[PDB]
């Protein structure tokens, strides 16, 4: 009945802002889960940057890449919303810095560069997700072109469930060895675009790592988080939403509220 009451509350929340909410949440302490629309498809927007960063660290682990190698891009015309890469245009960035910047500031320039030189583009990102047993994730287009969030379009979609499972394998599981996993968590923990989402839903002495996404279209926005509650097993929370009309803006408070709902469902 915990589950059944959670679902009523998500459902009321989606009708209220005239839109569509997708939730999956995991207490690793118990295996307890809660999903609502947890197998429907939802645009990734920038949220794949979170996986992007994990792919880089996987390649560093494998020694196909060096975390401190210099990534020069001085001639590039940087994509809109590259606020870290603009500042190092002239001098370059270590790979590690570039990849965390993609993660923690949603730096599109960092993203496309990484996906063009190191990752095999959208298909290689999809390949990485497959390699950890994610059959839902698909990235189709490059950083700026994948936020059309057309209802019914499968390009650049995953499912809340897929997203959470994957976050679990990557953040908490055994995809990354100990040293590398630690860095991945630190990167998540320092994300700077997520204050009004899953972060706003948890006691202020919980530690959170997250990656957001904001399509700017169809009011589409998402967050997913690893949460370390005070003296208990980590939780995973995955929240995706969209809305009925192209012109609708996203809702931080809906994401925040749905997170609170999801966390009580599994608590
Ligand atoms: C991908 O979805 C997308 C990026 N990534 C974002 C994200 O992770 O949320 C979004 S929006 C996010 C909210 N603040 C930051 C920021 O750095 N700049 C900014 C720009 C306009 C308004 C505000 C504000 O009022 O705080 C903040 C961005 C972002 C659009 C794109 C690049 O595909």
C-alpha 25/C-alpha 227 separation (Å) is 11
In angstroms, the CA 148 to CA 101 distance is: 23
Q: Would you list the DSSP string of 8-72?
A: HHHHHHHHHTTEEEEEEEEETTT--EEEESTTS-EE-GGGGHHHHHHHHHHHHHTTSS-TT-EE-
Tokens 């990102």 found at = 125
Q: How far apart are CA 243 and CA 187, in angstroms?
A: 30
Burial 237-253 (b: 16+ CB within 10 A, else e): bbbbbbbeeeebebbbe
Topology of domain 2-265, CATH: Beta-lactamase (3.40.710)
Report the nearest atom of ligand 1 relative to the CA of 214: 2
Q: For the chain, after which residues does the C atom lie more than 2.5 Å from the next written residue's N, i.e. where is it broken?
A: none
Could you give the 3-state DSSP secondary structure of residue 221?
A: strand
- Count helices and strands (H / E) in the chain: 8, 9
Structure tokens at 187: 């990167």
Helix (H) or strand (E) holding 157, with range, is: strand 157-158
Determine whether 14 is an active site residue. no
Task: Output b/e per residue, 86-102; b: 16+ Cβ within 10 A.
Answer: eebbeebbebbbbbbbb
- Going by the annotation, the residues of the binding site are 46, 49, 106, 108, 212
Cα–Cα distances in angstroms (integers) from residue 213 to residues 1, 33, 65, 101, 265, in the given order = 31, 23, 27, 14, 24
Mention every residue, 6+ apart, whose C-beta is less than 8 A from residue 255. Answer: 196, 197, 198, 221, 222, 223, 239, 241
CB distance 5 to 260 below 8 Å = no
> How much distance in Å is there from the Cα of 174 to the middle of ligand 1?
31
The two structure tokens encoding residue 150:
């057309």
59 φ, ψ to 5°? -65, -35
Q: Strands 70-71 and 235-243: what pairing?
A: unpaired
Of 102, 193, 199, 221, best ligand 1 pocket probe by most atoms within 8 Å of the beta carbon: 193
Q: Is 145 a catalytic residue?
A: yes
Cross-strand bridge partners of residue 224: 211, 238
**Catalytic site residue from 46, 82, 214, 259:** 46
- Listed resolution, Å: 2.3
Going by C-alpha positions, the residue among 52, 78, 27, 22 that lies closest to residue 170 is: 52
Report the phi/psi class of residue 56: left, alpha or beta, with left for phi > 0 and alpha for psi in -120 to 50: alpha
Residue 200 burial by Cβ neighbours in a 10 Å radius (0-12, 13-18, 19+): middle
HEC profile of 165-216: HHHHHHHCCCCCCHHHHHHHHHHHHCCCCCCCCCHHHCCCCCEEEEEEEECC
Nearest CA to ligand 1 atom 7: 213
DSSP state of 231: T
According to the entry, how was the structure determined?
X-ray
Left (φ > 0), alpha (ψ -120 to 50) or beta: where does 231 sit? left
Residues annotated within a binding site for a beta-lactam? 46, 49, 106, 108, 212
Tokens 């290689």 appear where?
A: 124
Residues lining ligand 1, judged by CB closer than 6 Å?
45-46, 81, 106, 108, 147, 193, 212-216
């Amino acid at each position: 009945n915990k589950s059944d009451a959670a679902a009523k509350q998500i459902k009321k929340l989606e009708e209220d802002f005239d839109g569509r909410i997708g939730v999956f949440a995991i207490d690793t302490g118990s295996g307890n889960t809660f999903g609502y629309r947890s197998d429907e498809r939802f645009p990734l927007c920038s949220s794949f940057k979170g996986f992007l960063a994990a792919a880089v660290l996987e390649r560093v682990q494998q020694k196909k890449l060096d975390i401190n190698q210099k990534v020069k891009y001085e001639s590039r015309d940087l994509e809109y919303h590259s606020p870290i890469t603009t500042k190092y245009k002239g001098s370059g960035m270590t790979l590690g810095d570039m990849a965390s910047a993609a993660l923690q500031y949603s730096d599109n320039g960092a993203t496309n560069i990484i996906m063009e030189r190191f990752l095999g583009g959208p298909e290689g990102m999809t390949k990485f997700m497959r390699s950890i047993g994610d059959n839902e994730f698909r990235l189709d287009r490059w950083a700026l072109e994948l936020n059309t969030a057309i209802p019914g379009d499968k390009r650049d979609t995953s499912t809340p469930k897929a997203v959470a499972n994957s976050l679990n394998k990557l953040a908490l599981g055994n995809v990354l060895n100990a040293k590398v996993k630690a860095i991945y968590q630190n990167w998540l923990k320092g994300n700077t675009t997520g204050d009004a989402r899953i972060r706003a839903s948890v006691p202020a002495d919980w530690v959170v790592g997250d990656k957001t996404g904001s399509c700017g279209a169809y009011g589409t926005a998402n967050d997913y988080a690893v949460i370390w509650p005070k003296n208990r097993a980590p939780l995973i929370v995955s929240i995706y939403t969209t809305r009925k009309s192209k012109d609708d803006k996203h809702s931080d408070k809906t994401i925040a509220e749905a997170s609170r709902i999801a966390i009580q469902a599994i608590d």
